[PDB]
Amino acid sequence: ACVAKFGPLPSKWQMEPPKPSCVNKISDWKLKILQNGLYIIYGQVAPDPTYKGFAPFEVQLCKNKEAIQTLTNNSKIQNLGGIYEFDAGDIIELRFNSDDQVLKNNTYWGIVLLVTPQFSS
Amino acid sequence: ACVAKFGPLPSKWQMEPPKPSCVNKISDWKLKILQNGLYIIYGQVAPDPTYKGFAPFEVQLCKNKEAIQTLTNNSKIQNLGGIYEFDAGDIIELRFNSDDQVLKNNTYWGIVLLVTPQFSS
Amino acid sequence: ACVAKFGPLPSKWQMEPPKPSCVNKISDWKLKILQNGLYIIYGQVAPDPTYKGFAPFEVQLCKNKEAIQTLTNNSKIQNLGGIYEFDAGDIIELRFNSDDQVLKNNTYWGIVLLVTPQFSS
């Protein structure tokens, strides 16, 4: 298999196998797809109920800097999930309207390679 | 593989294999996760269009007594699905605002173990 | 494995393997389930931002002519995904409120057979 998870802090990128064929970590919360195919994304976003800043609550799962999912409920932990066809070179990341509006010690996301069809490239 | 389905009535828990490593049935609509890992949940909730009771329509998929999904549309059969990381000991159940507001003979839910990453424990 | 994808145009049905055990193509955007089991559906719906017709924007994923998902946002590409238990003979299709309100050259859907439990038949 090929799976990866970022977080929750203090854990960073956890890849199985450690140098997987399907993805490459770029930086915290961000990876690059290496293998064309169908991927399942999962995750958990934990709002900080004591947030004291300016930003509306919003967490975005992004593909090449564009939000493919947006989570906007600040009252509960929200789970995310999806199935997507990705191309080699696609950049996938979880982005926060403010770092301070989530509990990073209870927030994570990951990815599982499901299949690699010829039609995905 | 490791898969389980409850219902629709009169079927109860259907586990494959019959004593699976990944989950244990507890009672109708309720199971316990035995193996840390990534699970896909699926299901179908069929409202009873002749319900005559007091409760608003709501069906909850719950993890340790907390709703991780809520279905509130009483006009159509609703499908549920999700991908989740669960821990051994987690209790997963489908809960109804009223037993009488769903057609249990057309309502079911189940679970499929997808992968068991080291990072899930 | 057993996977299929329709589109985006000019690609039509792409099945792997080419004559798969699990599904049979019927016509553009439409297939028939041959094997009882749990399937993951995925897809992408690209609205045409220059649509000049009469219909409200709506794209339906249908099972036996009934919409199991509806996509109604004309402002962005929308991804679809779901996990479903299907029966042999079920007809699955993507249906548009108007052919002219989507960009068929950037719209596709597909299916992956996940497992074939005895309880699915």
Closest Cα in chain C, distance from residue A83 (Å): 6
Amino acid at C107: T
What single letter denotes the amino acid at residue A4? A
Q: How far apart are CA B116 and CA C8, in angstroms?
A: 34
Phi, psi of A55 (to 5 degrees): -85, 140
**Pairwise CB contact (< 8 Å): A119 & C5:** yes
Segments in B1-121 forming alpha helices (H): none
A-B C-beta contacts closer than 8 Å? 35
Measured distance CA(A40)–CA(A110) in Å, rounded: 8
Three-state secondary structure call for residue A105: helix
CB atoms inside a 10 Å sphere around CB C49: 10
Which value, to the nearest 10 degrees, does the dihedral of the CA atoms of residues B110, B112, B113, B119 take? -70
Domains of chain C, start order? 1-121 (2.60.120.40)
Tell how far CA B75 is from the center of its chain: 20
Decide: B19 and B80 in contact? Cβ < 8 Å: no
Rounded to a whole number of angstroms, the CA Rg of chain C reads 14
Q: Is the Cα torsion angle A18, B33, A39, A13 positive or negative in sign?
A: negative
State which approach was used to obtain the coordinates: X-ray
Long-range contacts of the stretch B74-79 (C-beta < 8 A, 24+):
B74/B47, B74/B49, B74/B101, B75/B47, B75/B49, B76/B47, B77/B44, B77/B45, B77/B46, B77/B47, B77/B106, B78/B44, B78/B45, B78/B47, B79/B42, B79/B43, B79/B44, B79/B45, B79/C68, B79/C82, B79/C84
SS (H, E, C) A3-52: EEEECCCCCCEEEECCCCCCEEEEECCEEEECCCEEEEEEEEECECCCCC
Residues A6, A12: Cα–Cα separation, whole Å: 5
Q: Does the beta-carbon distance from B119 to A5 stay under 8 Å?
A: yes
Taking an 8 Å cut-off on Cβ atoms, the answer to whether C119 and B16 are in contact is yes
State the maximum Cα–Cα separation within chain C, in Å, rounded to a whole number.
Answer: 49
Facing C115 at nearest CB: one of B3, B14, B44: B3
- How many degrees, rounded to 5, is the angle at CA A23 between CA A21 and CA A29? 155
User: What is the radius of gyration, based on Cα positions, of chain B?
Assistant: 14
DSSP secondary structure of B73-99: -TTS-EEEEEEEEE-TT-EEEEEES-G
Distances (CA, A) of A95 to A49, A58, A108, B95: 18, 9, 11, 33
Please give the residue of chain B at the shortest CA–CA distance from A15: B119
Inter-chain touch B42–C68, beta carbons under 8 Å: no
Buried b (16+ CB within 10 A) or exposed e, B5-36: bbbeeeeebbbbeeebebbebeeebebebbbb
How many C-beta neighbours within 10 Å does residue B88 have?
13
Strands (E), chain C: 3-6, 13-16, 23-27, 30-33, 37-45, 59-63, 66-71, 78-86, 91-96, 108-115
Backbone angles phi, psi at A44, to 5 degrees: -145, 130
Question: What span, in angstroms and rounded, lies between the C-alpha atoms of A102 and B17?
Answer: 40
Q: Is C1 on the interface with A (CB under 8 A)?
A: yes
Asked if residues C16 and C3 have their Cβ atoms less than 8 Å apart, the reply is yes
Measured CA to CA, the distance from residue B80 to residue B68 in angstroms comes to: 11
How many whole angstroms separate alpha carbon B86 and alpha carbon B117?
11
Beta bridge partners of A92: A31, A63
Tokens 């929200």 belong to residue: A78
**Pairwise CA distance, residues B89 & B24, whole Å:** 10
From chain B, the residues in CB contact with A11 under 8 A are 119
CB pairs under 8 A between A and C: 35
What's the N-to-C CA distance of chain A in angstroms?
Answer: 20
Angle at C83 between CA B90 and CA B10, to 5 degrees: 70
The sign of the CA dihedral B86, B88, B94, B97 is negative
Query: Which residues partner with C92 through β-bridges?
Result: C31, C63
Partner C, chain A 24-83, Cβ-Cβ below 8 Å: 38, 68, 81-83
Euclidean distance between CA atoms C12 and C91, whole angstroms: 17
**φ and ψ of C120, to 5 deg:** -85, -5
What is the rounded CA–CA span in Å between residue C1 and residue B73?
35
> Which two structure tokens, joined as six digits, stand for A80?
């995310």
DSSP SS3 for C40: strand
Backbone angles phi, psi at A100, to 5 degrees: -80, -10
Q: What is the resolution of this structure in A?
A: 1.5
